[PDB]
Amino acid sequence: QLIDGVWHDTWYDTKSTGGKFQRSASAFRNWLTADGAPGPTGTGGFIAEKDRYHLYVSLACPWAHRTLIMRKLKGLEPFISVSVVNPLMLENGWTFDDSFPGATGDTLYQNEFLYQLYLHADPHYSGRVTVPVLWDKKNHTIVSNESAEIIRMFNTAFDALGAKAGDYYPPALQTKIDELNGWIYDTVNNGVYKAGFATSQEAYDEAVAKVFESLARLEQILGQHRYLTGNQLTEADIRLWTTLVRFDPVYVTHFKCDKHRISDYLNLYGFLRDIYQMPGIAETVNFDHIRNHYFRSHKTINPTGIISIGPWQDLDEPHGRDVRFG
Amino acid sequence: GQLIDGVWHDTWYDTKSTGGKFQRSASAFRNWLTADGAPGPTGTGGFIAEKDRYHLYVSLACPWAHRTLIMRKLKGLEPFISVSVVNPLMLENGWTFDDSFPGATGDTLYQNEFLYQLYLHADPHYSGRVTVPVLWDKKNHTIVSNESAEIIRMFNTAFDALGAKAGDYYPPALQTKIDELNGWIYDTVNNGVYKAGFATSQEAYDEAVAKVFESLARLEQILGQHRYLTGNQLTEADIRLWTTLVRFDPVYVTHFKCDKHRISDYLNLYGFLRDIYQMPGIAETVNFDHIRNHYFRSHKTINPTGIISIGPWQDLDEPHGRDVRFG
């Protein structure tokens, strides 16, 4: 964590006294727009254009992963450059230590720590230092560090400039999507963390049951049609998939969500391989980063730092859900 | 923890050592219970098979201790061997006689507080690990054996003339095959899962866990040829493999990170697991609460939180067919 301009090695902190962290922690909720107008929150004028915006991600984070997937589906590679922090999130938090294969270092300003860029945008900044970060190269500031919104910007803001066709938040499906997003976040995306980081046996039992209850639900839905809302791929699927692709390799063992493996569900496993095999998506998946990060960064639950050999799986097996449905 | 010169050490066992290759009690307890009281190949004589003399201190969580409980059922030795179950929580005092946990009985002979008190009684200045199972001699108030591989040999024959059920799980004809299996099954599986769970470095874990799955693969091949490891006869090699197998999905998979495959993913190993589990008398010896509680809560070095994972789903009651499939 990063308190009023200074870092604190998990020293967050001595306690509280006014009052939640803080008045600038989600002060990065601006929107990229096509006209430069401010979005529904934050301020303008971050207008969609080339060679201006940049992504700071870890390949290990399921939230940052969303933005990489949307970057591929929408053909935004020629508009949006990418920096990849080191997988080992140690005492300094996200680090620009390259050397780990696929780690790039701060390829813009050559900083040494992710928290440095947060300061370069607000030196009096109080709050968490998270990926993903959508960065304005021209104002040297943070547009947004909220992945749920970054993927919506990517969805339309670049269309006139030549983005690939696709709308992952179509006005018709929006209420279904917001609804799915609601419980999928609480019971699955964030669910596996509530379980893996649970404080007591009682906490863990409640969290992990929610996880598997929802999996049974999703298995059912997938079920009646190819994706969550029907025959159309939406951001609700992408948001579910980033957790799913990490489930068998990390969450099952590391976060003790071990009642069933994704590979045990007919549909969920098919869904997993489906999106996995979409052109361009496999390359955004890097299991070394994923596994090194979780097993080595979380000393409070895996003190030994040992990376388990991992549940067996083959994501390249043809899935036939394109045929099966509708 | 560990006893040093009669003194228990809360897991500072010891402050290194400076002396060094424990000990004069590394001689452990290796006497043999025999039919006529003659001495076995180690230890001394006088431990003749009889009623109301011998007792067994176990944990329901321990695969080694579990071997002796199973042999006790198969051979019908309940009339001759009484049993005490220590508490599953193995903390800073080692095995404990804390009842309160269901299945824990306290010390049914002398109501001690700690397993290590029994060791001290046998050897007031004992230096070594305080382990289960312990075969205790009520007459001479000492320890006969604390070596599970030998206790099962004793159970297998020592009582044959006093009413033990017919059955030889180490018969002359199969001894060579059995000894060979025991050798590699012990090093890569019974103890292999431990080498993996407690590996100090990533390299140590990598080598242990691969040998574990390499051996399961080999075992899967063997158990697709006949009902048991050596053919159509159950032997101690099966029993020794089984006690690990039954703990594999509830604990070793998650807790010891042996998670490439689940036993339920193997047709034959999973059949063999259900097959032995469903033999009369066997299921009573299995207590998943003791097992899952012991491993997750006791090993704070591996699992600081002491959280007990919900655990891989399984079902050992479903019929297995192995009684017919072969041969």
Ligand SMILES: N[C@@H](CCC(=O)N[C@@H](CS)C(=O)NCC(=O)O)C(=O)O
């Ligand atoms: N709500 C934000 C937060 C993203 C997030 O939780 N990122 C994690 C990755 S697991 C992170 O960088 N955490 C580091 C920290 O909290 O110190 C989002 O959806 O992107």
Ligand SMILES: N[C@@H](CCC(=O)N[C@@H](CS)C(=O)NCC(=O)O)C(=O)O
């Ligand atoms: N040599 C013993 C080994 C059994 C053993 O080490 N049991 C473990 C339980 S998993 C134990 O009592 N360990 C206690 C300790 O080391 O402190 C045998 O094979 O009978």
